RNA sequence: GGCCACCUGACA
RNA sequence: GUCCUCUCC
RNA sequence: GGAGAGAGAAGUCAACCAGAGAAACACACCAACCCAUUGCACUCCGGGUUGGUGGUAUAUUACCUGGUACGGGGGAAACUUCGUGGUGGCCG
């Protein structure tokens, strides 16, 4: 169990010493495939560094790339992917 | 005339 | 140039 | 947010005003390491160690150049030159 389908989907276990800009830009690169991202939000502070949140226009686009992507290995650790908990803002306000 | 502590005051 | 309270905009 | 005022930490300084005038300290940010973190967010934002950069600190308190109130000289005089916090203790 553990999650519901959501537009965004939850990743962790992410390699800490990728910059910001370039986490995104990687992780924009490798789930593009799977539908378009509405956004990606990535902080590096105390409690949000190591994850990285992927909002998906379509959520059947999320399942996708959670169906694919889990265990991808990426900056050298295998990804760890979960629906998100809650729907993102963007999603919500829509 | 030096050195540590403290006091008063200037700066802030 | 930090921090705290007060006044005013 | 911004503008005033009080209180003042840290640090520098010492009759006092003025002109010039750093440093120290605090604060912010960047970089590299280290430590901690496996964390579900949508208002930046963990800690430490080095190094660096920044500010209407465009400050003022040393240093400097002028004078002021006292005190040391010389000079009839004009005037010119030396010295300028409190208390206890330690080092010739
Ligand atoms: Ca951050
Ligand atoms: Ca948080
Ligand atoms: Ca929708
Ligand atoms: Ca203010
Ligand atoms: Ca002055
Ligand atoms: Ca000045
Ligand atoms: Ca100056
Ligand atoms: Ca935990
Ligand atoms: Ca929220
Ligand atoms: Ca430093
Ligand atoms: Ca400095
Ligand atoms: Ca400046
Ligand atoms: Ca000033």
Known sequence: ??????????????????????????????????????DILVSRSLKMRGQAFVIFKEVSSATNALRSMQGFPFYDKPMRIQYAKTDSDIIAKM
């Open 1 to 38: 169990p553990e999650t519901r389908p959501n537009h965004t989907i939850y990743i962790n276990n992410l390699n800490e010493k990728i910059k910001k800009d370039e986490l995104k830009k990687s992780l924009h690169a490798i789930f593009s495939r799977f539908g378009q991202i509405l």
